[PDB]
């Protein structure tokens, strides 16, 4: 709370790609929608994506946004990115949610 501020909140089903099985799987193990933030650590000017399931508050994503990230807006309601360890996808609950999140992501990627 002291070092980070939320710069957006968006509704999405958070998924990760199981490359061994070539299938998307629910992040955290159970399907359903989460409230997904981008948090800005204002002191170090770093950003991370944190999402929590609406129903039971489980943290299902907590990943750094590195400078230079390629954010792929595959469709108007499904966006995705990768790191060295995982491929992440957000199935947004609406186009408005996708726009809110992408706008904050693109902002983070510009100021990083």
């Amino acid at each position: 709370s002291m070092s980070e501020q939320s710069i957006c909140q968006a509704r999405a089903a958070v998924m990760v790609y199981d490359d061994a099985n070539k299938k998307w799987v629910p992040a955290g193990g159970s399907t359903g929608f989460s409230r997904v933030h981008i948090y800005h650590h204002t002191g170090n000017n770093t950003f991370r994506v944190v999402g929590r399931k609406i129903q039971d508050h489980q943290v299902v994503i907590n990943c750094a946004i590195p400078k230079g990230l390629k954010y792929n807006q595959a469709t108007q309601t499904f966006h995705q990115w990768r790191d060295a360890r995982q491929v992440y996808g957000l199935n947004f609950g609406s186009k408005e949610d996708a726009n809110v999140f992408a706008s904050a992501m693109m902002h983070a990627l510009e100021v990083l």
């Binding site: 790609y17 792929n72 995705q80």
Partner: peptide, 5 residues
């Protein structure tokens, strides 16, 4: 990047 589910 992988295709959408």
């Amino acid at each position: 990047x992988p295709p959408p589910x």
